[PDB]
Design an enzyme around this catalytic site. Structure first.
Site, PDB file in Angstrom:
ATOM      1  N   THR A 158       9.016   4.020  -5.968  1.00 20.45           N
ATOM      2  CA  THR A 158       9.518   5.214  -6.695  1.00 20.45           C
ATOM      3  C   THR A 158      10.885   4.951  -7.333  1.00 20.45           C
ATOM      4  OG1 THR A 158      10.404   5.956  -4.662  1.00 20.45           O
ATOM      5  CG2 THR A 158       8.279   6.948  -5.328  1.00 20.45           C
ATOM      6  N   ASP A 159      11.684   4.045  -6.775  1.00 20.04           N
ATOM      7  CA  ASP A 159      13.087   3.826  -7.226  1.00 20.04           C
ATOM      8  C   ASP A 159      13.183   3.549  -8.735  1.00 20.04           C
ATOM      9  OD1 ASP A 159      13.626   4.212  -4.544  1.00 20.04           O
ATOM     10  OD2 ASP A 159      14.611   2.239  -4.264  1.00 20.04           O
TER      11      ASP A 159
ATOM     12  N   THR B  94       0.853  -1.209   0.000  1.00 16.62           N
ATOM     13  CA  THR B  94       0.000   0.000   0.000  1.00 16.62           C
ATOM     14  C   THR B  94       0.883   1.251   0.000  1.00 16.62           C
ATOM     15  OG1 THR B  94      -0.145  -0.106   2.377  1.00 16.62           O
ATOM     16  CG2 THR B  94      -1.923  -1.182   1.191  1.00 16.62           C
TER      17      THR B  94
HETATM   18  N1  LIG Z   1      12.478   2.208  -2.309  1.00 15.10           N
HETATM   19  C1  LIG Z   1      11.269   1.331  -2.132  1.00 15.10           C
HETATM   20  C2  LIG Z   1      10.365   1.944  -1.041  1.00 15.10           C
HETATM   21  C3  LIG Z   1       8.988   2.428  -1.472  1.00 15.10           C
HETATM   22  C4  LIG Z   1       8.956   3.715  -2.266  1.00 15.10           C
HETATM   23  O1  LIG Z   1       9.780   4.641  -1.991  1.00 15.10           O
HETATM   24  O2  LIG Z   1       8.091   3.798  -3.147  1.00 15.10           O
HETATM   25  C5  LIG Z   1      10.651   1.098  -3.524  1.00 15.10           C
HETATM   26  O3  LIG Z   1      11.096   1.669  -4.538  1.00 15.10           O
HETATM   27  O4  LIG Z   1       9.712   0.318  -3.686  1.00 15.10           O
END
Ligand SMILES: N[C@@H](CCC(=O)O)C(=O)O
Ligand SMILES: N[C@@H](CCC(=O)O)C(=O)O
Ligand SMILES: N[C@@H](CCC(=O)O)C(=O)O
Ligand SMILES: N[C@@H](CCC(=O)O)C(=O)O
Lengths: 317, 319, 319, 319
Positions: free
Chosen positions: A80-81, A12
């Site tokens: 987001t990575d 989520t």
């Molecule tokens: N760095 C993780 C943590 C969640 C996020 O920052 O979206 C990802 O890319 O899934």
């Protein structure tokens, strides 16, 4: 009401048919007023664990859903990575003009001032908006609509980490109010020549990070591990160190496609600067970045390894 | 008049005896600089900055140290290719044992071009070099009317005359047609305050950089190790996160005494401690607020006196 | 535990006895700040920041001066509307006679919104206020995980949570989930080093701001004079340039003894001396590296003790 | 070869019979452009852009319409001061009735300067004007290797060669040593799609711009009404917010039939409807995603064919 499917690739960010999407609807109840929501769980991973396997599964499912007359758009919740790579992949593989919106959160749903609820709410408004048709795949983050081709995570931690450093956002979404100011004039989605419907594994492409006192052993390991392509993230305007250039020239001659990008963060890695691409057998990636260059090169390699055809692909898309 | 040495690493950045033909041509191109200072000139190397090596950094640093230790010399201007100026600047910023100004300057456009940026960049660089406020600012890059702290500077763009930026901090000052003003200064130790000494070093330790992506590999970590990497910068995804196969390879690197430092591919922001990566259990260092090319330079210097994870974390939490 | 006072100028920036009901509501919504400091609260005014006045400015600076002169008080946080936070911060930056931290914080989204930025801003702001390194940094704005020097800070965007920027210099520091790191400090005198003393001032000199454009007018200079302007900030075209008709009126204003300071509408960069405007002959000041609204605050303070053009220019070339 | 007319509004932007000595000088300073196009020249005016008036805008837009209606003429380039180029560019964006490229170009440094930006800027503009993909992009500003939509473009810095930006969207393309690439295009109607027609206009309606601050006044609103303002742009605090005293004067302005349009002093983002100001009740217009000085140009054009609040809101929500 518009029918929209949320595809979750992880947890989520804040029965529809996936408990994760059920929880999103609980956390952000205002979205149930905007669209009839169906949920699927495509994968359950952090975006840093993404694989070509999951990209191809995701892209084929999006194509299935958007071929259905009842489905008006797809939203994808994604870490987001690597959202920029998935987004860009989908921009060249999704055979529709219906909106596909990728959304995430730079802070976890349980944090003070979590960004994920506003982001998701804005995403749904973007997905159902009439103007969003034939804008291609977009990232919706922090009240901004970014074209998949141009979008990148520029910052490690900031809620405003997404940027389009070569062109800027195409639009805004502020408490659901959607306004476009521009659109991409590079072909995407339905106008794309790429088709991954009968692809089950994407060609291997490595990315090398250029610096002073560079090496050839990483070029050489990529070759030994079956690289069908190499993106060189070069110094300034895609310039390699000499030892590395020599290794890359050999790479190209053996039929591994070498495409020059840059480590700097913005601008075009241009043809006919200091590197004789035609003589060395290299491709100039122009106004992309190493990680999106990699996606475009993987897609190129599903149907050619000819230097000229791939240059034309990089100069078109 | 103030006595300044210009050290050329390459060709002319402007135009087309002070003791070097390259610097005689700079003085012919931008005669205004002769009125500002008595210029001496030396050729340190003969290369585009994409060809820079640890050998040239060491020659350049030792020579700057010798020149600024002379009572008569007030500053050094280094003319440098733009591609790797940020690395050279960050290297001298931690090895130069003096408060006297050290100013790096180059040209995004060739001297022969329409609207060549070199002449203004050089003229400005001279004014920064001789300005009293430039003392104990550390090493600076002067480009496009801007003064950037070596720690914070990077080439952010492939072609633009404004390609230099300090994404985490902003320029420390401005220089407009010679007029020099500082608005900020670095609070991170530099130059005289630096623990690093390369006077007795002839070869810097090997450090590789790896570019992270989805569907990543262990075969570049293993190739780095096999070529005798003392250090590895990992340009991770987002907040310095590795792919699983890659973390596994880096864990084996870190146990074998190779120092693994986590930076990021993104462009800006700190690769933080106590995020998604358990650095203490895995044996890693977090680079925090640098970038992979400058984190490489700091790890090379860290490795000249320790391979200890805790010591090296303290180095990255300090400089 | 550190003793910090929160001064509220309006409503709650977080959520939907410390001494002020507004601050009690902040502590309820953000309970994690209570393990960080002993919080006392006072209500200074009850307004949106678009309703700010010189009267509230003087009340605020006098009370902060009193509070920071107490041996029990380590820092002051001021909750403030975002629209004019930069003006208040810059006023305090030149009127607060302490090196103890003064932090301004607000919220671009209201507390009752989805993804409200107030709770994190306020938590981050307390961590900055109590950090040892915040001493003698001058008044700062803490917004969106960034520490901005009051001299340099501006709201650059109408609606974005990242609306605050320092366009001439960048953030002096980061605060991330409470972790405070400074990377720079301003080298322009502030707080304890300022020559300004408003302790005996009950009303600020009147300063008007004019917006330059093609086909400009003299009637607004004339109305500003008619209403008793002691100073006028001209927000000029490009590098502080006026339209001919406007410049003629500004000349008359200056000869009558009203201080005319050239700023710029553009957003960033220095409104420079010795450009296209003969400031000496016409009797004008150049505001250099500020913006019209902050130039206004500095002129208002300059007029509490001179209207001499050369004295005021030195003031603008200093702070 | 393509036929291009260069229109001069001031002096040479490069160096120190096409039909105009200014353009003859341009061609001798940058002989590269003779190979790319058959250049004709005219002198429309001979002013610094800070001295521009609606009279020059109307003379210029009418002559551009004449030139582009000729079958022999492929494009127009206009050399212009940088200070008000965004205003003229925007005016032409809504008044030029052709899809043929119109390109504005200037220089942040004088032609006689070290590293003059003028020669390259002009060379790149001619290449953008003759490019096939320049058709139906609207009027563009070519500066510093970038192509900016007239709608989105602004001078953001007082001095920097990279002063021009599109803060709400970014450049729509690049031009690097003549090579032209578009990446986006405006989806807001322009040129041939615009409802505006100035062919039977002699004088543009008077519109003033007011600069908002704490302790604001009514005497500038009142002076604007007394001087016969048909429109007032209010450059508001944050998201277009007024000081109360000033709001009450603008409400009276609006009830008089003077169109009040709310913009912002901040630099970027939308001045939105249905935020904190009751636009519909107060009788105001939200300018949304523009800036004070381009909103002034749109309101002046609006005021050539309606003063109805509802019709002008639709115009600002459309263009
Ligand atoms: N760095 C993780 C943590 C969640 C996020 O920052 O979206 C990802 O890319 O899934
Ligand atoms: N690639 C060359 C070009 C010159 C420059 O841009 O500085 C270098 O870095 O040396
Ligand atoms: N514009 C109001 C709303 C609150 C805020 O954005 O800070 C103010 O400045 O007080
Ligand atoms: N202020 C002058 C200078 C020339 C320029 O920078 O364009 C103008 O706008 O005309």
């Amino acid at each position: 009401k518009p029918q929209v499917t949320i595809l979750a690739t992880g947890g989520t960010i804040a029965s529809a048919g996936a408990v994760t999407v059920d929880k999103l609807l609980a956390a952000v109840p205002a979205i149930n007023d905007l669209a009839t929501i169906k949920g699927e769980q495509i994968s359950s991973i952090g975006s840093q664990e993404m694989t070509g396997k999951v990209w191809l599964k995701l892209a084929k499912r999006v194509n299935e859903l958007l071929a259905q007359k009842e489905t008006e758009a797809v939203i994808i919740t994604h870490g987001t990575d690597t959202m920029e790579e998935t987004a860009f992949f989908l921009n060249l593989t999704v055979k529709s003009q219906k909106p596909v919106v990728l959304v995430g959160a730079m802070r976890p749903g349980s944090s003070m001032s979590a960004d994920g609820p506003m982001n998701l709410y804005n995403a749904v408004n973007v997905a159902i908006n009439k103007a969003s048709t034939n804008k291609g795949v977009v990232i919706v983050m922090n009240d901004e609509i970014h074209a998949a081709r141009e979008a990148t995570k520029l910052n490690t931690t900031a809620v405003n980490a997404f940027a389009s450093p070569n062109t800027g956002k195409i639009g805004t979404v502020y408490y659901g109010k959607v306004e476009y100011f521009t659109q991409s004039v590079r072909p995407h989605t339905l106008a794309s020549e790429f088709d991954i419907s009968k692809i089950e594994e994407l060609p291997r492409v490595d990315i090398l990070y250029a610096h002073p006192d560079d090496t050839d052993v990483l070029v050489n390991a990529a070759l030994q591990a079956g690289a069908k392509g190499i993106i060189h993230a070069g110094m300034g305007n895609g310039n390699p160190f000499p030892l590395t250039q020599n290794a890359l020239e050999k790479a190209a001659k053996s039929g591994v496609v070498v495409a020059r990008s840059s480590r700097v963060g913005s601008g075009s890695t241009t043809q006919e600067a200091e590197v004789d691409d035609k003589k060395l057998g290299f491709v100039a990636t122009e106004s992309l970045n190493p990680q999106k260059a990699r996606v475009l090169l993987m897609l190129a390699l599903t149907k050619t390894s000819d230097r000229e055809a791939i240059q034309k692909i990089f100069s078109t898309y």
